[PDB]
Amino acid sequence: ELRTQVDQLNIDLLELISKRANLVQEIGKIKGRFDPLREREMLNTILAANEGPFEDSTVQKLFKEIFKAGLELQEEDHSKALLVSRKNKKEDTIVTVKGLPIGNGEPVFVFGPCSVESYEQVAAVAESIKAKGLKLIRGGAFKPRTSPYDFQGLGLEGLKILKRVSDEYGLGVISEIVTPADIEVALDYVDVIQIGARNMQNFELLKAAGRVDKPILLKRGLSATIEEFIGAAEYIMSQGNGKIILCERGIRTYEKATRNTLDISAVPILKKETHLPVMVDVTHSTGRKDLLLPCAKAALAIEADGVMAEVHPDPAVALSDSAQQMDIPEFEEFWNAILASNLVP
Amino acid sequence: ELRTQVDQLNIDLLELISKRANLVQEIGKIKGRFDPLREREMLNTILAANEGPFEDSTVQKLFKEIFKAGLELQEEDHSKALLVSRKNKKEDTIVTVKGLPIGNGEPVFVFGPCSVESYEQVAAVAESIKAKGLKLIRGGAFKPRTSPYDFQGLGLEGLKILKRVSDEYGLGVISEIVTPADIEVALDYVDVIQIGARNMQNFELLKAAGRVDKPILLKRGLSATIEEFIGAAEYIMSQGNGKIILCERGIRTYEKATRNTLDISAVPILKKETHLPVMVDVTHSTGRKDLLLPCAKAALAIEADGVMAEVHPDPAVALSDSAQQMDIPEFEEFWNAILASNLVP
Amino acid sequence: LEELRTQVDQLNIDLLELISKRANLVQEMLNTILAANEGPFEDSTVQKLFKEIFKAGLELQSKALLVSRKNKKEDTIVTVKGLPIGNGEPVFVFGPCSVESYEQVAAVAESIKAKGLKLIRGGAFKPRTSPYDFQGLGLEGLKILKRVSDEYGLGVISEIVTPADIEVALDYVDVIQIGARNMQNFELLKAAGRVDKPILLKRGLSATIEEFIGAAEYIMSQGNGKIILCERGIRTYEKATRNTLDISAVPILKKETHLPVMVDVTHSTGRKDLLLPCAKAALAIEADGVMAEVHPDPAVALSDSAQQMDIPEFEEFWNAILASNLV
Amino acid sequence: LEELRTQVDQLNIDLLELISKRANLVQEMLNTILAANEGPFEDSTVQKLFKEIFKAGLELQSKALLVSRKNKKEDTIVTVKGLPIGNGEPVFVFGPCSVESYEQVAAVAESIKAKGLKLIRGGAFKPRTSPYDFQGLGLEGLKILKRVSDEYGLGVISEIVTPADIEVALDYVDVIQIGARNMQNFELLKAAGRVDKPILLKRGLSATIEEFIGAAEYIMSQGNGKIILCERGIRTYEKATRNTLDISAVPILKKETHLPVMVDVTHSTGRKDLLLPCAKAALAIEADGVMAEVHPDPAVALSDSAQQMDIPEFEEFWNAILASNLV
Ligand SMILES: [Mn+2]
Ligand SMILES: [Mn+2]
Ligand SMILES: [Mn+2]
Ligand SMILES: [Mn+2]
């Protein structure tokens, strides 16, 4: 009887909360952000006025939540509908690379050596890729290594090699860039800039990639949560570049039977939450040659936008992932199985 | 020149190591095991005779390895070729349940409620399963719960309900048994005894299941390694029962977007290492209704021997997994998608 | 600006008064609120704000777990062989991983008694990853432990692995241990909860704090409140150690529950070289006890051969504890 | 039995003599050995045994990492603002999570100086999960920190997030911090290795010990050996804490490397109620220092609002450290 009226005190709060929120954004316009001093000044006034029944600490918590809500109204704050989210843009993003519309429903395959070692080595792989009618190649010029004494990659010379081979065999180049200063130079040699797992939270590198007009392949961090992975993509897109391809490549767990644990569920999670295409790297996730094909099949069936695997003409002598890379005859058998699976329309 | 002869000291060691190994097994026959006292007595004699160049600690380590190797020669020790391994038996194990040869290459599907709540509730699910031409049903009479105050299951009465419904609708029953004393009673009510994730290393329960003639569905532990999972299956098979179906159901990781992380790579790993069929539980791994179908598709494409998912006539009122279980119309849509996928031959 | 700011400040006061008045009165409903939402916030934000407002109401306005301090504020003290575990003075539990023979266990017992210590741990039933590794002597092992207990005056802690063995164990042990792999063997927990005997409950390989507390509740809900919790490391990606000792579990559990908390330094780290440092950390963080393994001839042990301290190593370890002034 | 046993015993001696003689001589090859295998062991076992025999040979028969004790046995001491970090006396580093203003940082500095402490930590560049959360004041923040350092006489520790900023930072900080998320930002590590300035390297979110050591090696391989390692918790399934403080990392790193090792108790646990207990554990396990956050008004802080101690809380925390006798 009396608690029917407490129902209208709710309509009064909504009106009050909404009106206040509008005024605060007006103050933002008249001026031009975080202001802890103003927040404390507001809290002092509110708490001084508290006559109960709530204790000061409870009142402070409630108002903080109200203030926090206001931040999302800011033009530049997309916390409530991330630019990379379907909440922001419902339609799938198509990232076109060498005429291939990545994300359009037809899966793409990216093969290539772990590390660029020589012109002849990359050419041998490009020849086998072209022979299958494929159009992309991946190759590491800059290699993130656990130890500084392991092969770091050929650097710029590796990118030059990749460009030479690609220009001749008609392939698009995907290669990793490891520091902000190298992004500008990379534009003349690659078709897609890869940001590696270990750099997924190298924020200045993400921002740098967000300021150029070039597709970015962002690999999930070794132990990144889906939220963090989406957040990293937002760093790129918030600078202007929306041409982002996400890549699942396994996460770190207690399991020793595999190098990492392929998190296949990330594909449908990311395709639901974001509008960005999602690929799966079957080589670096499992770290096992005998699992490349089964994992590739799982990836395609779960509707990944693409699959990446490593191929090297003589894996025995490779400067990285010697036991994981497929040789040319193995690559032929792998591809014949993919062709026979009917998983690619 | 002189190190060509050190090559023949190798042939002498093999002969000596082999002859010794044979004598020790003869001692085992003449007698009838672990004997730390004899090991120390042997080590005292060996170390007393050490004139170098190795230090006593190094000599002790080498002989321990030699002694350790001898253990595998014991008849009852299968450490080097586990009974569940392909090294022991190359051919796939087929586990026949209600006329279905699980493991023969044709995937099977197991649907049913998380918990058995009443005759009518289970019957409603059995009716939808039978309508699709399916032949198995799963239902929890004993429910392992984090809190003792959550619904523990109906117990024996739940098994009686399952039997009644199954006998009428022609379905085979899969249900979890949680303690050794309950295995004997279960034989009259179930077609497959399930050992849950939390009991994967309840060894006395495994041994008890190994002493009866009834198919066992062994779920992988929350954080079990593949080695531990295979070891658990060996506890069952070492007692005589080789009718074991392995079930991947996700592993515990830092990720919060899912309840557990489905480890899809476990399927091809287990199918390579062992001769046992392997199923995937898509409900308990992801803990998310929107991921059941994608995960089921991945499971089938990676050649799992079966898929398990939960169905409840009114999930809102369910006593467990209320948000994860599919209702009857959802189950129809799920099944129609499976039928349309061509992933089941 | 001053103008708009003073209006915002007045609106702030209006909200306080409006919120508190409503609270006084209140002292399903979101459906009608959202219907009146006309911006600038989206429905989800509006809803999140009112839920915080309703939650506040439960400030000054019986389902506590039995093992929680909410249920019982005072510390639980479990007295074993005369030692009041949980009273503020840490206890030390040493002993071999596996019971292998009477002579072996007696050698460790002698060394324990020599230090004025009163407890011994020894495994008669050993859970093993592989069925082909030593499984324990079983009942014979319990009988050995009871003989040693009668002879050396030490209280025995030993693992029980199945519900039926709980009743059998009562005649042989002073504390029943439930191993990490059985932390969610719920029928075993209920069996342990039905007897009048202290239980040492080890955290599961990957058990959360909530799950560990829940497991203890299974035991106490059957009637047995003499429960000692044991942190023994958690499973992680790190390979330098067997498990990752989670030292933070001690103060967390001491705050949330009234149960004593011990730390097993051998099974957590799996490294002899880390036993002393981890024992010092456990004592400093106020654990109620430390457990470590000691064997007269570790090289030939049937379990944890590289992790167990021999008798001379045990003497050095103990002398270091006495010199640390951490007790 | 006696008969067969004495033969086995003689065969044992024959192996010792045969093995040692071969070793004396030795002082690809498995291919020929297996060819002669005729049982009872399978080839895999035979091969595993000879590999152990060949390995032994490398007993009494230059590629050590620069950061390893194998390279340099003596402890590295890093002196900052007159304090010799790593000399056996633990140091304490307090300060706010983010630099928000001069007045804010100065308030904490005053409290630090009042205790006779000499270091302060403050983030001018803040790595954040979301690009919409406060990113730090940047260069302005470094300038504030240097002003406070000149005024209160404290050495400044602050995070640098990109290679270009390493050189800029030299004029403002006494120690450059490399954050957990950048532990494998290899170009940043190399940049830090090319300057003459102490570096505080935080363990990555899920970095292994090996990886952490490797990261330190990137720095030292460029010439800079003034590296302080910082354990700050590792990512696990546990939700009761932000991260799992891995206390075992301290003695492991102190044994493997010659570099000092600190523990950040705020970022590991993410819980104000665990700061003191974890600091006591870190001191007892012999960490070279402890780091914790202090803010004059945590409720309004732009990062870690619930984790930072206010000034009165900092006083209680410090008084407890002084009363513990753990220093
Ligand atoms: Mn690679
Ligand atoms: Mn369920
Ligand atoms: Mn042990
Ligand atoms: Mn902080």
PDB file of C-alpha atoms in Angstrom, chain A residues 113-239:
ATOM      1  CA  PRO A 113      58.458 -20.274 -43.205  1.00  0.00           C
ATOM      2  CA  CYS A 114      58.808 -19.390 -39.537  1.00  0.00           C
ATOM      3  CA  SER A 115      61.918 -17.290 -40.306  1.00  0.00           C
ATOM      4  CA  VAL A 116      63.166 -15.671 -43.532  1.00  0.00           C
ATOM      5  CA  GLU A 117      66.595 -17.238 -43.998  1.00  0.00           C
ATOM      6  CA  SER A 118      67.467 -16.593 -47.662  1.00  0.00           C
ATOM      7  CA  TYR A 119      65.993 -15.682 -51.026  1.00  0.00           C
ATOM      8  CA  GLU A 120      66.144 -19.313 -52.200  1.00  0.00           C
ATOM      9  CA  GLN A 121      64.456 -20.656 -49.053  1.00  0.00           C
ATOM     10  CA  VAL A 122      61.510 -18.262 -49.295  1.00  0.00           C
ATOM     11  CA  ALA A 123      61.226 -18.725 -53.069  1.00  0.00           C
ATOM     12  CA  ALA A 124      60.923 -22.507 -52.684  1.00  0.00           C
ATOM     13  CA  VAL A 125      57.959 -22.027 -50.360  1.00  0.00           C
ATOM     14  CA  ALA A 126      56.378 -19.298 -52.544  1.00  0.00           C
ATOM     15  CA  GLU A 127      56.597 -21.640 -55.542  1.00  0.00           C
ATOM     16  CA  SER A 128      54.613 -24.342 -53.716  1.00  0.00           C
ATOM     17  CA  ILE A 129      52.059 -21.792 -52.474  1.00  0.00           C
ATOM     18  CA  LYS A 130      51.546 -20.374 -55.997  1.00  0.00           C
ATOM     19  CA  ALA A 131      51.276 -23.907 -57.396  1.00  0.00           C
ATOM     20  CA  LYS A 132      48.208 -24.434 -55.191  1.00  0.00           C
ATOM     21  CA  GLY A 133      46.535 -21.216 -56.394  1.00  0.00           C
ATOM     22  CA  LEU A 134      47.027 -19.597 -52.977  1.00  0.00           C
ATOM     23  CA  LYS A 135      47.742 -15.868 -52.676  1.00  0.00           C
ATOM     24  CA  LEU A 136      49.362 -15.066 -49.303  1.00  0.00           C
ATOM     25  CA  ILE A 137      52.704 -15.807 -47.678  1.00  0.00           C
ATOM     26  CA  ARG A 138      53.951 -15.238 -44.124  1.00  0.00           C
ATOM     27  CA  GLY A 139      57.621 -14.963 -43.167  1.00  0.00           C
ATOM     28  CA  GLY A 140      59.481 -13.702 -40.112  1.00  0.00           C
ATOM     29  CA  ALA A 141      62.127 -11.008 -40.634  1.00  0.00           C
ATOM     30  CA  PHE A 142      61.963 -10.039 -36.948  1.00  0.00           C
ATOM     31  CA  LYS A 143      61.720 -12.996 -34.593  1.00  0.00           C
ATOM     32  CA  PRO A 144      60.826 -12.579 -30.919  1.00  0.00           C
ATOM     33  CA  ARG A 145      63.037 -15.091 -29.041  1.00  0.00           C
ATOM     34  CA  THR A 146      63.136 -16.136 -25.404  1.00  0.00           C
ATOM     35  CA  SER A 147      66.934 -15.820 -25.419  1.00  0.00           C
ATOM     36  CA  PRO A 148      68.872 -12.896 -26.902  1.00  0.00           C
ATOM     37  CA  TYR A 149      71.386 -15.413 -28.266  1.00  0.00           C
ATOM     38  CA  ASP A 150      68.892 -17.172 -30.513  1.00  0.00           C
ATOM     39  CA  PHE A 151      68.382 -16.047 -34.149  1.00  0.00           C
ATOM     40  CA  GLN A 152      66.648 -12.630 -34.053  1.00  0.00           C
ATOM     41  CA  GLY A 153      65.776 -12.554 -37.765  1.00  0.00           C
ATOM     42  CA  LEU A 154      67.462 -10.802 -40.702  1.00  0.00           C
ATOM     43  CA  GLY A 155      65.565  -7.531 -40.065  1.00  0.00           C
ATOM     44  CA  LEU A 156      65.123  -5.092 -42.957  1.00  0.00           C
ATOM     45  CA  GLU A 157      67.005  -7.454 -45.282  1.00  0.00           C
ATOM     46  CA  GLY A 158      64.421 -10.139 -44.493  1.00  0.00           C
ATOM     47  CA  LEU A 159      61.616  -7.753 -45.521  1.00  0.00           C
ATOM     48  CA  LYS A 160      63.453  -6.927 -48.760  1.00  0.00           C
ATOM     49  CA  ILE A 161      63.724 -10.634 -49.544  1.00  0.00           C
ATOM     50  CA  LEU A 162      60.011 -11.105 -48.848  1.00  0.00           C
ATOM     51  CA  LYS A 163      59.105  -8.252 -51.175  1.00  0.00           C
ATOM     52  CA  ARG A 164      61.321  -9.616 -53.993  1.00  0.00           C
ATOM     53  CA  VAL A 165      59.857 -13.108 -53.745  1.00  0.00           C
ATOM     54  CA  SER A 166      56.280 -11.887 -53.387  1.00  0.00           C
ATOM     55  CA  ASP A 167      56.524  -9.485 -56.338  1.00  0.00           C
ATOM     56  CA  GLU A 168      57.629 -12.372 -58.536  1.00  0.00           C
ATOM     57  CA  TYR A 169      55.238 -15.050 -57.319  1.00  0.00           C
ATOM     58  CA  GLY A 170      52.221 -12.709 -56.897  1.00  0.00           C
ATOM     59  CA  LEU A 171      51.698 -13.260 -53.175  1.00  0.00           C
ATOM     60  CA  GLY A 172      50.641 -10.845 -50.432  1.00  0.00           C
ATOM     61  CA  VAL A 173      53.097 -10.541 -47.567  1.00  0.00           C
ATOM     62  CA  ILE A 174      52.316 -10.928 -43.889  1.00  0.00           C
ATOM     63  CA  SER A 175      55.279 -10.237 -41.560  1.00  0.00           C
ATOM     64  CA  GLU A 176      55.804  -9.250 -37.922  1.00  0.00           C
ATOM     65  CA  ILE A 177      56.870  -5.767 -36.885  1.00  0.00           C
ATOM     66  CA  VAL A 178      58.287  -5.509 -33.352  1.00  0.00           C
ATOM     67  CA  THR A 179      58.687  -1.826 -32.481  1.00  0.00           C
ATOM     68  CA  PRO A 180      56.834   1.480 -33.303  1.00  0.00           C
ATOM     69  CA  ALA A 181      59.748   2.999 -35.211  1.00  0.00           C
ATOM     70  CA  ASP A 182      59.634   0.075 -37.711  1.00  0.00           C
ATOM     71  CA  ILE A 183      55.971   0.486 -38.729  1.00  0.00           C
ATOM     72  CA  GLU A 184      56.656   3.322 -41.232  1.00  0.00           C
ATOM     73  CA  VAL A 185      59.401   1.369 -43.023  1.00  0.00           C
ATOM     74  CA  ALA A 186      57.294  -1.797 -43.151  1.00  0.00           C
ATOM     75  CA  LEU A 187      54.593  -0.102 -45.254  1.00  0.00           C
ATOM     76  CA  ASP A 188      56.740  -0.452 -48.378  1.00  0.00           C
ATOM     77  CA  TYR A 189      57.424  -4.166 -47.874  1.00  0.00           C
ATOM     78  CA  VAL A 190      54.371  -5.836 -46.343  1.00  0.00           C
ATOM     79  CA  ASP A 191      50.690  -6.218 -47.198  1.00  0.00           C
ATOM     80  CA  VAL A 192      49.750  -7.103 -43.614  1.00  0.00           C
ATOM     81  CA  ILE A 193      51.613  -6.066 -40.470  1.00  0.00           C
ATOM     82  CA  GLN A 194      51.632  -8.781 -37.801  1.00  0.00           C
ATOM     83  CA  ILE A 195      51.761  -7.914 -34.095  1.00  0.00           C
ATOM     84  CA  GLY A 196      53.047 -10.982 -32.237  1.00  0.00           C
ATOM     85  CA  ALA A 197      51.720 -12.611 -29.092  1.00  0.00           C
ATOM     86  CA  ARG A 198      54.490 -11.190 -26.884  1.00  0.00           C
ATOM     87  CA  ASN A 199      53.633  -7.670 -28.125  1.00  0.00           C
ATOM     88  CA  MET A 200      49.825  -7.906 -27.797  1.00  0.00           C
ATOM     89  CA  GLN A 201      50.066  -5.463 -24.846  1.00  0.00           C
ATOM     90  CA  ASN A 202      52.900  -3.327 -26.271  1.00  0.00           C
ATOM     91  CA  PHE A 203      50.456  -0.418 -26.370  1.00  0.00           C
ATOM     92  CA  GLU A 204      52.667   2.140 -28.112  1.00  0.00           C
ATOM     93  CA  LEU A 205      53.186  -0.446 -30.899  1.00  0.00           C
ATOM     94  CA  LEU A 206      49.389  -0.928 -31.125  1.00  0.00           C
ATOM     95  CA  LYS A 207      48.780   2.824 -31.318  1.00  0.00           C
ATOM     96  CA  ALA A 208      51.465   3.152 -34.013  1.00  0.00           C
ATOM     97  CA  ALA A 209      49.764   0.407 -36.057  1.00  0.00           C
ATOM     98  CA  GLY A 210      46.461   2.236 -35.550  1.00  0.00           C
ATOM     99  CA  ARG A 211      47.826   5.411 -37.179  1.00  0.00           C
ATOM    100  CA  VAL A 212      48.692   3.833 -40.585  1.00  0.00           C
ATOM    101  CA  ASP A 213      46.499   2.546 -43.438  1.00  0.00           C
ATOM    102  CA  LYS A 214      47.523  -1.103 -43.570  1.00  0.00           C
ATOM    103  CA  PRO A 215      45.824  -4.334 -42.444  1.00  0.00           C
ATOM    104  CA  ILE A 216      47.061  -5.557 -39.054  1.00  0.00           C
ATOM    105  CA  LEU A 217      47.117  -9.207 -37.928  1.00  0.00           C
ATOM    106  CA  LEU A 218      46.930  -9.121 -34.133  1.00  0.00           C
ATOM    107  CA  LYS A 219      47.966 -12.318 -32.346  1.00  0.00           C
ATOM    108  CA  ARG A 220      46.478 -13.148 -28.953  1.00  0.00           C
ATOM    109  CA  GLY A 221      48.883 -12.781 -26.009  1.00  0.00           C
ATOM    110  CA  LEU A 222      50.379 -15.894 -24.395  1.00  0.00           C
ATOM    111  CA  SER A 223      47.921 -15.629 -21.490  1.00  0.00           C
ATOM    112  CA  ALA A 224      45.605 -12.846 -22.705  1.00  0.00           C
ATOM    113  CA  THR A 225      41.945 -13.017 -21.732  1.00  0.00           C
ATOM    114  CA  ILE A 226      39.364 -12.446 -24.457  1.00  0.00           C
ATOM    115  CA  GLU A 227      38.606  -9.073 -22.853  1.00  0.00           C
ATOM    116  CA  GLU A 228      42.297  -8.075 -23.048  1.00  0.00           C
ATOM    117  CA  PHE A 229      42.530  -9.280 -26.678  1.00  0.00           C
ATOM    118  CA  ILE A 230      39.496  -7.199 -27.632  1.00  0.00           C
ATOM    119  CA  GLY A 231      40.978  -4.272 -25.687  1.00  0.00           C
ATOM    120  CA  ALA A 232      44.225  -4.519 -27.648  1.00  0.00           C
ATOM    121  CA  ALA A 233      42.289  -4.466 -30.919  1.00  0.00           C
ATOM    122  CA  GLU A 234      40.509  -1.333 -29.611  1.00  0.00           C
ATOM    123  CA  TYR A 235      43.876   0.449 -29.123  1.00  0.00           C
ATOM    124  CA  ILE A 236      44.472  -0.026 -32.834  1.00  0.00           C
ATOM    125  CA  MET A 237      40.986   0.967 -33.980  1.00  0.00           C
ATOM    126  CA  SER A 238      40.760   3.994 -31.648  1.00  0.00           C
ATOM    127  CA  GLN A 239      43.639   5.584 -33.637  1.00  0.00           C
TER     128      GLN A 239
END
